[PDB]
Amino acid sequence: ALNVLIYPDDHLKVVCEPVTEVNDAIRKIVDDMFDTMYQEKGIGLAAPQVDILQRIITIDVEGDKQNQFVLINPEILASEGETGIEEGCLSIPGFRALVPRKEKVTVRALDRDGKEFTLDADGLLAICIQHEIDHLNGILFVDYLSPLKRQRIKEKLIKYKKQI
Amino acid sequence: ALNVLIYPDDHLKVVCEPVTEVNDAIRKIVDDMFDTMYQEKGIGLAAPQVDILQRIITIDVEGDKQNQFVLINPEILASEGETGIEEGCLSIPGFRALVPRKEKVTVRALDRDGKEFTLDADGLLAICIQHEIDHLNGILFVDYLSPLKRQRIKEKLIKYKKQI
Amino acid sequence: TALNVLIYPDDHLKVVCEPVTEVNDAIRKIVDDMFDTMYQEKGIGLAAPQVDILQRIITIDVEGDKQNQFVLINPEILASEGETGIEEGCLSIPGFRALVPRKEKVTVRALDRDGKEFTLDADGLLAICIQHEIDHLNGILFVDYLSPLKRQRIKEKLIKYKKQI
Amino acid sequence: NVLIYPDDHLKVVCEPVTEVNDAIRKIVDDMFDTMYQEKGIGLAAPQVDILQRIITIDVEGDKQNQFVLINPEILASEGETGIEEGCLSIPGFRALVPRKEKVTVRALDRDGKEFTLDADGLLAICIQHEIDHLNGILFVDYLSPLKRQRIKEKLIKYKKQI
Ligand SMILES: CCCCC[C@H](CC(=O)NO)C(=O)N[C@H](C(=O)N1CCC[C@H]1CO)C(C)C
Ligand SMILES: CCCCC[C@H](CC(=O)NO)C(=O)N[C@H](C(=O)N1CCC[C@H]1CO)C(C)C
Ligand SMILES: CCCCC[C@H](CC(=O)NO)C(=O)N[C@H](C(=O)N1CCC[C@H]1CO)C(C)C
Ligand SMILES: CCCCC[C@H](CC(=O)NO)C(=O)N[C@H](C(=O)N1CCC[C@H]1CO)C(C)C
Ligand code: NI
Ligand code: NI
Ligand code: NI
Ligand code: NI
């Protein structure tokens, strides 16, 4: 466990600093993220969701330490296609939204040992990558809703946070 | 007489929401922005720098108010060339650095009464437009610098903010 | 006594300054005061008559981080080339800028903070600052390249401003 | 009244005249009068504490070939030459000043009409001297720092003496 920030929260809206150096401290943040992610049954997690304002993403679609991706200072280089599934967020518990995404994405990033890599993804991986990168730029799925819908979500989550 | 946010500040790193409605309130904000820009002797200003997280930019290169530019929900249509000047920012006081920029730019935006316009710009104007639209995506000139230089500026400004 | 600056209009902003006879420590103290004034007011260049010292002294730091402080005492342009322009501002003329026709590259000889002679090639902003500050040493401001009308308008705003501050 | 070096107004770059009106023409006439009373062949407004670009020259001394230069500017100039130049604002001193021998100068006359003049010899020299004044430059500024200092100090003590 680290603490998962719930919307609304300023650090869920912040564009994160790139990692300067992928070292031991960073790799502990990565392992701690994986833990929290699995504990919460997430298929991805972005650093700011646990109050760390750095560009670090952990992903595991199938959720069994199989295809574990670490994406540090990631950038989408190319994309194509159109898709959109109903997305939920650990930082926005209890809500879903159809989010228009690119079907296919090609991404560059540093792995947990600091080595650059480039990855082509589609389907769920591609969507999860995009959901996670929005996080790094302080964008949530609610940001694709109407200001009115988003507001109503917000009010409800405020309640849930005093309640918890 | 609105106050300018000083780096580091979470709200200087926020992607701002589109203005949905260019109404009297947005116009009041515009006039307040110009006042602050003039008071603080800037040539441009983005709404987040006065802590208003919407896509509103005010520019006046000469400062005599003859050629005021209001850019609401701006989008760069196209750009080319290269330049850079050691750029300063009211939100990063005392520091300047060369930023790689396009030399010439064409933006579309809404004016003060919500009428669409297109503007072609070069020279300083073009540079300011890019810098100000960068603020709207939660990007500052120090984010183009080495993390080392960015860090020094951050440290020296946290000091200065305490003094204030 | 505060790190303040003469504001246009003022006679001493149009005075032609005399060469420093010797770079002693009244002068080095003027240099350090100028830098502090530049930094206080978030400027990139300064000339001595802007803090009311009628001497040929200029301090420049384009980046603000002190990593590249230039000091130029009794400067002279050996040569220059090309032309350029950027809407220039001045701490002595707050809230205004105007494009001023400048040389793009410039070669300047001057004395450093210790009194030792250097030569500097400069382009870009640096070269524009050098020229702008040398103009100050010769009782010339950016408003003097404008039209009587534009300048008179600026003067009028600035009197008003000076009062209110 | 003629200012005596040192004085900040003898170092001030003067403002252009915007209208050649009657205030200006009185200035011009008051300047010739002062120039002749004090035995000069050239005078510049700041020498009489008027910070505007106005020059009054008479090399002859006879009110015959009087030149008036308002908002002058040099367009061309060739050759080198020199003379032991004095200045009514710097009484009791002269210095050899390297000048252009020939000068081309465009200015407004006494009634604000534009004219352009080629000049040589003494005229040319005074024109340069007198434009220097409008740009805050005195003949002593062509001297070594210590020599300038020396004269400034004597004239400071001379100034008190009256
Ligand atoms: C779809 C794009 C990736 C979503 C990532 C999120 C984790 C998160 O909030 N990242 O910022 C998640 O796992 N959400 C879960 C989720 O929505 N899941 C889990 C299995 C399938 C998928 C349904 O969208 C929740 C509801 C447990
Ligand atoms: C430089 C491109 C435009 C930057 C805009 C800034 C104002 C700002 O903080 N905008 O977000 C500005 O006015 N900058 C000034 C500035 O530093 N300038 C003015 C000319 C270019 C640049 C420094 O070279 C400051 C000191 C008032
Ligand atoms: C750049 C030419 C040299 C001017 C330097 C001045 C400081 C000054 O008054 N020097 O005499 C400055 O810092 N000017 C700034 C300024 O306006 N700049 C920065 C770069 C160009 C110009 C405006 O575009 C101000 C507003 C802080
Ligand atoms: C030639 C340069 C113009 C100098 C004219 C000066 C008058 C002056 O003060 N001009 O600014 C003059 O006549 N000065 C006299 C003088 O000494 N002479 C003799 C004629 C001109 C000058 C020598 O240049 C006085 C002091 C007696
Ligand atoms: Ni999420
Ligand atoms: Ni800025
Ligand atoms: Ni200046
Ligand atoms: Ni004279």
UniProtKB/Swiss-Prot annotation, chain D:
The keyword Transmembrane helix does not apply. It holds the Pfam family Pep_deformylase. Keywords: Hydrolase, Iron, Metal-binding, Protein biosynthesis. Its EC number is 3.5.1.88. Its cofactor is Fe(2+). The active site is at 130. Gene3D superfamilies: Peptide deformylase. It comes from the Bacteria. Fe cation binds at residues 87, 129, 133. One of its GO terms (biological process) is co-translational protein modification. Binds 1 Fe(2+) ion. Removes the formyl group from the N-terminal Met of newly synthesized proteins. Requires at least a dipeptide for an efficient rate of reaction. N-terminal L-methionine is a prerequisite for activity but the enzyme has broad specificity at other positions. This is Peptide deformylase. It comes from Haemophilus influenzae (strain 86-028NP).
